[PDB]
Amino acid sequence: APKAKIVLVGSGMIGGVMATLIVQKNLGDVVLFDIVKNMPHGKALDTSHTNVMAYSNCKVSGSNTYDDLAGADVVIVTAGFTKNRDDLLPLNNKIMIEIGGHIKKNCPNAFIIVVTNPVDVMVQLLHQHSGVPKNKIIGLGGVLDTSRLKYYISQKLNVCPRDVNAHIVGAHGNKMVLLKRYITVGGIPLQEFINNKLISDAELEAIFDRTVNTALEIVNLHASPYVAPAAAIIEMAESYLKDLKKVLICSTLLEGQYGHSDIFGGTPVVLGANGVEQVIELQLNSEEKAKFDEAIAETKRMKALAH
Amino acid sequence: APKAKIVLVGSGMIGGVMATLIVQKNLGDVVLFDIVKNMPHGKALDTSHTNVMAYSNCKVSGSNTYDDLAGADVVIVTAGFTKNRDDLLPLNNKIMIEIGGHIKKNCPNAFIIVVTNPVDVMVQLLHQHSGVPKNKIIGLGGVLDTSRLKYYISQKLNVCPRDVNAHIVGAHGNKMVLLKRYITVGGIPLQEFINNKLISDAELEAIFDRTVNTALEIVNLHASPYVAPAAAIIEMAESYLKDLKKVLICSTLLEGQYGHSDIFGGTPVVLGANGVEQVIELQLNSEEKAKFDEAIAETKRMKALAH
Amino acid sequence: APKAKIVLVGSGMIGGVMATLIVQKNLGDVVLFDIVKNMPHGKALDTSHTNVMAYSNCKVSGSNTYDDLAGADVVIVTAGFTKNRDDLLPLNNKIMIEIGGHIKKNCPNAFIIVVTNPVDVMVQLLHQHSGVPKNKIIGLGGVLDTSRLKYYISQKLNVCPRDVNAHIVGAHGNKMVLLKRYITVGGIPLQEFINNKLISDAELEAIFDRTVNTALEIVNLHASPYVAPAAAIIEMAESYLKDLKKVLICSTLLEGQYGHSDIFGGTPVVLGANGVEQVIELQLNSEEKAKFDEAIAETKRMKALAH
Amino acid sequence: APKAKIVLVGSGMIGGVMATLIVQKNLGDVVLFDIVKNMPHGKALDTSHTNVMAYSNCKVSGSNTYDDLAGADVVIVTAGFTKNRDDLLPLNNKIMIEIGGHIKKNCPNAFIIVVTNPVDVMVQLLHQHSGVPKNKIIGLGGVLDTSRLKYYISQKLNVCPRDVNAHIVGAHGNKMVLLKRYITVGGIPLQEFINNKLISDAELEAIFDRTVNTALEIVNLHASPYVAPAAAIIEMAESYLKDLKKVLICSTLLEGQYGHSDIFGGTPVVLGANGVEQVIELQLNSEEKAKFDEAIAETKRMKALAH
Ligand SMILES: O=S(=O)(O)c1ccc2cc(S(=O)(=O)O)ccc2c1
Ligand SMILES: O=S(=O)(O)c1ccc2cc(S(=O)(=O)O)ccc2c1
Ligand SMILES: O=S(=O)(O)c1ccc2cc(S(=O)(=O)O)ccc2c1
Ligand SMILES: O=S(=O)(O)c1ccc2cc(S(=O)(=O)O)ccc2c1
Numbered sequence A, B, C, D: 001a002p003k004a005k006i007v008l009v010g011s012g013m014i015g016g017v018m019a020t021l022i023v024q025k026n027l028g029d030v031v032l033f034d035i036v037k038n039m040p041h042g043k044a045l046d047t048s049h050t051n052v053m054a055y056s057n058c059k060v061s062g063s064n065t066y067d068d069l070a071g072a073d074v075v076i077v078t079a080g081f082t083k084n085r086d087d088l089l090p091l092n093n094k095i096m097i098e099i100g101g102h103i104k105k106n107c108p109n110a111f112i113i114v115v116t117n118p119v120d121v122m123v124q125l126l127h128q129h130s131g132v133p134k135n136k137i138i139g140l141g142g143v144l145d146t147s148r149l150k151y152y153i154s155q156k157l158n159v160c161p162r163d164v165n166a167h168i169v170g171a172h173g174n175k176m177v178l179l180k181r182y183i184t185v186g187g188i189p190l191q192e193f194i195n196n197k198l199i200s201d202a203e204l205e206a207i208f209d210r211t212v213n214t215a216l217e218i219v220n221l222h223a224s225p226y227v228a229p230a231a232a233i234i235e236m237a238e239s240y241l242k243d244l245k246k247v248l249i250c251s252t253l254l255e256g257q258y259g260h261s262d263i264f265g266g267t268p269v270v271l272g273a274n275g276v277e278q279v280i281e282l283q284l285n286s287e288e289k290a291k292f293d294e295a296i297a298e299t300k301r302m303k304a305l306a307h
Helices: A013-024 A039-046 A050-053 A083-105 A121-130 A142-157 A190-195 A200-210 A214-220 A227-241 A285-307 B013-026 B039-048 B049-052 B085-106 B119-130 B143-158 B191-194 B201-212 B215-220 B228-241 B286-306 C013-026 C037-049 C050-054 C085-106 C120-128 C142-157 C189-194 C201-212 C214-219 C229-241 C286-306 D013-024 D038-048 D050-054 D083-108 D119-130 D144-159 D190-195 D201-210 D214-220 D226-241 D288-306
Strands: A007-008 A029-035 A062-065 A074-077 A111-114 A135-139 A246-255 A260-271 A275-279 B006-007 B029-033 B060-063 B074-077 B111-116 B138-141 B248-255 B260-271 B275-279 C005-009 C031-033 C060-063 C075-078 C112-114 C137-139 C246-255 C261-272 C275-281 D005-009 D031-035 D060-063 D074-077 D111-115 D138-139 D248-257 D259-274 D277-278
Touching: A007 A013, A007 C189, A007 D060, A013 A039, A013 A050, A013 A062, A013 A227, A013 D013, A029 C246, A039 A050, A039 A062, A039 D214, A039 D226, A050 A190, A050 D144, A050 D226, A062 C137, A062 C229, A074 A083, A074 A227, A074 B039, A083 A121, A083 A285, A083 B191, A111 A121, A111 A227, A121 A135, A121 A260, A121 A285, A135 A190, A135 A260, A142 A200, A142 A227, A142 A246, A142 A260, A190 A200, A190 C246, A200 A214, A200 B201, A200 D083, A227 A246, A227 A260, A227 D013, A227 D038, A227 D050, A246 A275, A260 A285, A275 B006, B013 B029, B013 B039, B013 B049, B013 B060, B013 C013, B013 C229, B029 B039, B039 C031, B039 C214, B049 C142, B049 C229, B074 B085, B074 B228, B085 B119, B085 B286, B111 B228, B111 D144, B119 B138, B119 B260, B119 B275, B119 B286, B138 B260, B143 B191, B143 B201, B143 B228, B143 B248, B143 C050, B143 C189, B201 B215, B215 C037, B228 B248, B228 B260, B228 C037, B228 C050, B228 C214, B248 B275, C013 C031, C013 C037, C013 C050, C013 C060, C013 C229, C013 D031, C037 C050, C037 C060, C075 C189, C075 C229, C085 C120, C085 C286, C112 C120, C112 C246, C120 C137, C120 C246, C120 C261, C120 C286, C137 C261, C137 D031, C142 C201, C142 C229, C142 C246, C142 C261, C189 C201, C201 C214, C214 D013, C229 C246, C229 C261, C229 D050, C246 C275, D005 D013, D013 D031, D013 D038, D013 D060, D013 D226, D013 D259, D031 D038, D074 D083, D074 D226, D083 D288, D111 D119, D111 D190, D111 D226, D119 D138, D119 D259, D119 D288, D138 D259, D144 D201, D144 D248, D144 D259, D190 D201, D190 D288, D201 D214, D226 D248, D226 D259, D248 D277, D259 D288
Parallel strands: A007 A029, A007 A074, A029 A062, A074 A111, A111 A135, B006 B029, B006 B074, B029 B060, B074 B111, B111 B138, C005 C031, C005 C075, C031 C060, C075 C112, C112 C137, D005 D031, D005 D074, D031 D060, D074 D111, D111 D138
Antiparallel strands: A135 A246, A246 A260, A260 A275, B138 B248, B248 B260, B260 B275, C137 C246, C246 C261, C261 C275, D138 D248, D248 D259, D259 D277
16 A cells, blocks of 8 residues: 555564554554564564554564565664674674665665664664665664653753753764753743753753763663654654654764764754755854764764774 | 533634534533524534544533533633724623623633633733632733744745744734744754755744734635634643643733733743643843833733723 | 645635644645635635644645646545525536536546535536546545434443444435444444333434434524534545545445445445445345435436536 | 543553553553562653653653552553463462552552453452452453454455454453454444455454464464553553543453353443443343353352462
């Protein structure tokens, strides 16, 4: 059908919330692909029954066959080793290479979202091996990182979480650049709320640290982050599929923005029917740019080790 | 039932989209009240059948009896003469008085939203005659006025309409204060988009004029505005009912904000389970404040004629 | 964009709720077309601002130009004289002819939904003059008529309205065939609820009469039916657009079902990406079929007068 | 807040999709309670960030303290040993006893949904130890079991999954009673589709076996069922919270229906603001009743071993 076909390359925990949310939102047919035998068929089966509860009609099928990438409109890549961090780099590069090959053969016109960490590295590797246009591949980062910052501020301020807006750029991971100057509450600069003593500078510094360290905080609580990563990816995928043209911070190919080329980094983009319709370059000051540069340098360091 | 009871005092065009949207959103039971015999029963009947299409369960009933205000959780007032403008003032004051009396008797604990124009005048009159607390009554203005500004900018910029945020304050009507400095696009100050030549200052001045004159533009096109007014009111009502704590610009009692007391004017407020949970005072400069003052003066002029 | 283009040929009251609901549901871009100068531009403007409140991104534009049918994915026809009934027949035939011509020229691949009454007559006339395939054009009837029956029963039984299912076939209008034997409550035959004394046969006979006479009841209450007609049409259009494959009772071309050919009549169909994917023929008994025959005869009588 | 408080007693896989869906649907504040230290705080944190993506405002908090049951409006019990089956019975009885004690002390007015298997046994044990009224506690079964049957049929018939309705009664588990006679497609008896050769009797027998064995099929595919169980529970909880009055098949206290008293079994009930508002007794024939009796006997056998 002219229903979108959404192929989830990797059927782990992120894959399993993504499938669930696609059905809840009736976004398209789903393929849960994985290298593990049968498991994705089992998850797919479980998930398919929710069509009833949700009043939806999305097929959800499992796959242990790469050729099921054929005809995909959207491909979401979570496959990769997670278990030092740097030693995994060349192993995951191999995974990106193999997936990129299959994308180039089976669905060269697919919109691709990469999640595999370190995302700003893996997304470019997949970009290079899949051959897809620069506007048709992006990496998960800023939507997810900002959800934490937005949420933490909204709880202090007692407002709707979505009413806090905020920008985190450069890279996903420990070098993420939190931009205090670009935080708003109901469209109003956060500095007004600081001036008013509704939230203090010291509080915000604790929230910034908490934001950066959230994955680690969840892992030390003996859980792992996958629900919010999944919702963020679906917000991105949905903006493409429904041509919403939402402004969403994602890892995209830089061509001069922030003084950087030939690298992917986190910046606000507009996602619509044509993929990345606009790359928005924040007019950073020199102090913010210095931090952006550190993010890019780290991405470059890890990319060099990936080969 | 512990379903909310929502009483629409006035069952005209705004009333009829409001009832429709309450059912679409399953927000609560609806009473379409009006002084016109039977018409609200007819609209209510029509609307009730949509429960099937929407998978909802909201009763929708008509009423020609004020005592059906009893037990209302939310009351929305659109009743009033619309057909000079100033001569209608004392006539609509009489309507606010009569409604306020019935609210005080039948539902003193209701959250009240006033739409009747000029809203910043009528809302205070109803406040005074209903006896309800200052945090439990508000007027429609800024949500609706900003929807126009946000929408027009979003079309120029090719972004999701909701991703433009903007503030219009002071009053509804021709003295509305559009604050250029408080416009953002995906949380980013609009000035960046001006610096970048994505939108010009002259364009924005045309959009500001268009925003102010939108009711008149719709009326000269031989229609009348009621769909968006209705959606805006429901966004407000929904924030209260579901305790969303959205930041929404509404007419509320001023107690010193902007140098003004003992008057209602448009400002961002937070709407939650406790009504107006926060009144947010924008840190306006002297030039913006001068325009705010003109808005208040006009409200005061018309209020004096209402008595 | 690959957003659907939905053209509403007729921008009256039904047209105005349809546009509103398309935006609420983010279903596609909307054109409000009408022969009345400027009015559809005014309604379209009003409606467009709701994109903000709804978090949607659908263009809503007015049109006084038939060529704006070009590229329509879905066309919904409400245009026609409403103000005896039979004398309007040839006048509305002329309207169907003119619209069909423009559909054939501008959007031969559009899915068409006809509302203009008497719908079972007008839909076939449009079918003949537009040249579209039999699976790509349908008429509004059963979804709307059954909404009333389902709703009235659900109120007596104190259950979710959607949990009552029911079939009304043959034609829209006074000859509609209500099939008692095909009513269920939560999938359970209604006869069990009658056996149990939760609802009586005499009650159901009053509900059947009320269902048939609902348009007239609304009109005698000094309103007119347009909200539910609009929601029903959007349920149909949405099933096509999103390939839901809902079972919905609509006027469709009969090719032997119920002993009838070369005529449109109300029966359950399945609406998906391929239009009418299945025509379902209820296995009526001779008594039910006699009533079906009367419905068809009346449609035929009026069709003969249309030429 | 007058937001509902929903306490999930057990924060495993079912608990984690339930929390996610409550936020997606903005249904109320969530507590993920578990005996495992910190894990529910970690899941709760992850889940809380989705408020941003979903435009919701639900708190999601973890808890290792039973007294956080205080003020719960809805309590959902998934805690229990899963790893023969009968040997776990007295162990899980102990868990129901401990939970029931805390419910009686902290939230005697809560609506309770039990999931712990065997559900028809555990729900009655919790009923007895919590002291709550018979209309305020139910067990998960029929909504979930029928989702499978409805889904499998809808795929054969190429219709919207929700348009298949079906009844499975008696008990959850291997003795579930699938009632062929109560299956409909778009409200039309399934036998018509059999008469028409759209689906065969032998196909349906394979689908019935598949339905019964679905948990086992998922487990043999190296997954486990938790997504659909979660969606089904939320459909139930949502019907209560929003007073939808949906007809949903659940385990409830029998007081003579089907010839059975002093036992819980699966039957259609109506869930609204007053809990179980109606217990609906299907008018089973002697052959269907014999199978119902076997279901009850097995529940009774296991209940006897639980003490
Ligand atoms: O590249 S790493 O493996 O060190 C890495 C970086 C960022 C991450 C973010 C998350 S998040 O989903 O919590 O944003 C989870 C795991 C991560 C791993
Ligand atoms: O007070 S007036 O009658 O002049 C007045 C003011 C503002 C208005 C705004 C609208 S709007 O709904 O277009 O915002 C409609 C009618 C209005 C009438
Ligand atoms: O053909 S008539 O003009 O007599 C006719 C038939 C059925 C109708 C149904 C409705 S309904 O929207 O109430 O179903 C409204 C007007 C109608 C007019
Ligand atoms: O009581 S058992 O442990 O044998 C039992 C019964 C029914 C079940 C149903 C499911 S289901 O979630 O697949 O319906 C899962 C586990 C189950 C365990």
